[PDB]
Amino acid sequence: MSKRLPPLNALRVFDAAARHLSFTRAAEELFVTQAAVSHQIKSLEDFLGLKLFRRRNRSLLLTEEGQSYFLDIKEIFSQLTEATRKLQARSA
DNA sequence: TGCATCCGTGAGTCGAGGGTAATAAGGTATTTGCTGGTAGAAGCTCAACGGACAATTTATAATGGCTCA
Numbered sequence: 604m605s606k607r608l609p610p611l612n613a614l615r616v617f618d619a620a621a622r623h624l625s626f627t628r629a630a631e632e633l634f635v636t637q638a639a640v641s642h643q644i645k646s647l648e649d650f651l652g653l654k655l656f657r658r659r660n661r662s663l664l665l666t667e668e669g670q671s672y673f674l675d676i677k678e679i680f681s682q683l684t685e686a687t688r689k690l691q692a693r694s695a
Numbered sequence: 696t697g698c699a700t701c702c703g704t705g706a707g708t709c710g711a712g713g714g715t716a717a718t719a720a721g722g723t724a725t726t727t728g729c730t731g732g733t734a735g736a737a738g739c740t741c742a743a744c745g746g747a748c749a750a751t752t753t754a755t756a757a758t759g760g761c762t763c764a
Contacts, residue, residue: 610752610753612752612753612754635753635754635755636754636755636756638754638755638756638757639753639754639755642752642753642754643753643754646752658761658762659762660761660762660763660764661762661763
C-alpha cells in the first residue's frame with residue numbers, strides 16, 4: 604500500500620494560519636500569494652474529510668474537526684529544519 | 696561335321712525368428728597420443744552513476760461569493 608503522505612506545502616501554511624489569525628497575512632511570511640492557501644486545503648482534505656476552520660467576521664477561530672490534525676503538523680517542520688542544520692553544520 | 700562343355704534361366708505379396716567360430720607367445724625398448732588440470736583470454740552481466748523530456752504540482756493572476764457593528 605503506497606503511503607500517500609500530505610503535501611509538502613499545505614502543512615506550513617496551516618501552522619501560520621492560526622498564528623497570524625488572517626489568511627492574507629499568512630501568505631506574506633511564506634512569500635506566496637493568498638490564493639495558494641485555498642488551493643492546498645482541498646487536496647489535504649481528501650485524507651481528512653474534516654473542515655479546517657470556521658468562518659468568523661474579521662477573525663479566525665478553531666474548530667474541533669481540524670484541531671485534531673493541528674497537533675500532528677507543527678513537529679514535522681521543526682525537526683526537518685533541524686535536520687537541514689545538522690548536515691550543514693557538520694559539513695562546515 | 697559331331698563331340699562333350701559351359702552358361703544363364705526357372706513368379707510373387709506376405710510372417711518369425713535371427714544369429715556362430717577349428718585356433719595362434721612372449722620378452723625388450725622406444726615411440727606416440729590422449730586427457731584432465733591448471734593457468735591465460737575473453738566474453739559476458741548485474742550494479743551503480745551522468746544527461747534530455749514530459750505527466751503532474753504549485754503558485755501566480757483575477758473573480759465572485761459570505762461575514763457584523
